[PDB]
């Protein structure tokens, strides 16, 4: 055993394309639809719990993850890749930030750290890029509420609302029509449930949908991240 892959597996092709990044983006395209919407008093992130079998307990598989008490993440693409990014995101939020400054990182900086990790898989020796795009929603004291997208390249962009994966082109058009700068959090949740219904084939309820919010503090502070329960989603589906 010598890890002899000390050379890049992502290289520029004659056209200027980085093949493996493009192919990672193709893997993200095949993944299940997830979306994010930013309100004035909160952010909502949502996705479909595409259950691999009905015998599987889909509650155990969390697509929406808490990164810090005020920052949450959802994805489209390869689940195992997402899982190890969440692990590294949580850790870097402590090592390079909380243990130094005594507070959690702001959304943009944690996003930047994740983006850095993804970039390194795009240039380091003997690795493929991550096959996920992340949607990171969060709040911090000086920047307020924010929503970011992070791609396999390591590029990140802030969004008012967006979607990634399967039906993202259709979902983004849907959001463009519905979004305004005076949405309350409940209005954004309502729009998220509408937008997500279009891309979902089968059952559409609280057990097959995962949906979380960055909002008010839930009782030093309380955490702003909150994952909606199966019941809480179903209640809003009756007013749909």
């Amino acid at each position: 055993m010598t890890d002899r892959y000390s050379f890049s597996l992502t290289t520029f092709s004659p056209s200027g394309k980085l093949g493996q990044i493009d192919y990672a983006l193709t893997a993200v395209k095949q993944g299940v639809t997830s979306l994010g919407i930013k309100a004035t008093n909160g952010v909502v992130i949502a996705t479909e719990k595409k259950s691999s079998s009905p015998l599987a307990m889909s509650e155990t598989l969390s697509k929406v993850s808490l990164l810090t008490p005020d920052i949450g993440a959802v994805y489209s693409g390869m689940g195992p890749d997402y899982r190890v990014l969440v692990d590294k995101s949580r850790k870097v939020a402590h090592t390079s930030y909380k243990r130094i400054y005594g507070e959690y990182p702001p959304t943009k900086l944690l996003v930047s750290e994740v983006a850095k990790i993804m970039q390194e898989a795009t240039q380091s020796g003997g690795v493929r890029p991550f096959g996920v795009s992340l949607l990171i929603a969060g709040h911090d004291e000086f920047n307020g509420f924010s929503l970011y997208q992070v791609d396999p390249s390591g590029s990140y962009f802030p969004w008012k609302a967006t979607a990634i994966g399967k039906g993202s082109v259709a979902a983004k058009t849907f959001l463009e029509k519905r979004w305004n700068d005076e949405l309350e959090l409940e209005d954004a949740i309502h729009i998220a449930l509408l937008t997500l219904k279009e891309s979902v084939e089968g059952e559409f309820n609280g057990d097959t949908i995962e949906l979380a919010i960055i909002g008010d503090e839930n009782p030093d502070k309380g955490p702003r991240f909150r994952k909606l329960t199966s019941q809480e989603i179903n209640d809003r589906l009756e007013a749909l």
Partner: protein, 244 residues
């Protein structure tokens, strides 16, 4: 073994070119145009964002113009992630120099350092080069206002006005036609926007598709001030110059 899969990123072609550098430059040619224009009383950085949707949150967005210290800024063309790696390295080098000499880093020294890092990826290590070209806008008390560019090869050069990214051929002709040595910042602002307005692949140049910045000594008591323009301010300067 592994040799089978090795692209060999650090070799010469038979013509004496570095394949990956050339192909990275091809990558950069498709990136949004960035322009730097140096006047007698300040520098202008202007750059065009790309793809953009109505849903992109522009006021919290930074893909083109980055700050290295209080005296030096860069405009980016290429992979934004690659640039941010190099930017954080440059930001450290500036602070290491400040800590060592108790003076702000001279612009050329920082530029050489970054350009030397880029060079290293072309000569050893077997890794792909950084798919980034920088325009460095900066000031120091030796040479005053300075514009530089670096590219994936690690070569850097100084400029009075320059473009990187898309349509540089067209952009550089238009700059070469309307630039003059006695020019001022307000005039250079206008030239930069007029150049982007003509070379853009979009139908029209609007505030939401632009990042804009100025390095003026034009401040009270002869001190250098960096101004990264806000979305509303870019919209105002577009109306002032008569583009919208």
């Amino acid at each position: 073994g592994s040799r089978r899969y090795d692209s060999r990123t650090t070799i010469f072609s038979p013509e004496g070119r570095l394949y990956q550098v050339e192909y990275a430059l091809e990558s950069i040619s498709h990136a949004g145009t960035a322009i730097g224009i140096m006047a007698s009383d300040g520098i202008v950085l202007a750059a065009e964002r790309k793809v953009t949707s109505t849903l992109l949150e522009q006021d919290t967005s930074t893909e083109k113009l980055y700050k290295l210290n209080d005296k030096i800024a860069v405009a980016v063309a290429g992979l934004t992630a690659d640039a941010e790696i190099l930017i954080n390295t440059a930001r450290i080098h500036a602070q290491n120099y400040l800590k060592t000499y108790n003076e702000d880093i001279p612009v050329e020294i920082l530029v050489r350092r970054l350009s030397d890092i880029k060079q290293g990826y072309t000569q050893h290590g077997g890794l792909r080069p950084f798919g980034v070209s920088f325009i460095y806008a900066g000031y120091d008390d030796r040479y005053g206002y300075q514009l530089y560019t670096s590219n994936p090869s690690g070569n850097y050069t100084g400029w009075k006005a320059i473009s990187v990214g898309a349509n540089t051929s067209a952009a550089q002709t238009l700059l070469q036609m309307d630039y003059k040595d006695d020019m001022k910042v307000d005039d250079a602002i206008e030239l930069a926007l007029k150049t982007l307005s003509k070379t853009t692949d979009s139908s029209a140049l609007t505030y939401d598709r632009l990042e804009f910045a100025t390095i003026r000594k034009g401040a009270n008591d002869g001190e250098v001030y960096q101004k990264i323009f806000k979305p509303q301010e870019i919209k105002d300067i577009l109306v002032k110059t008569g583009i919208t």
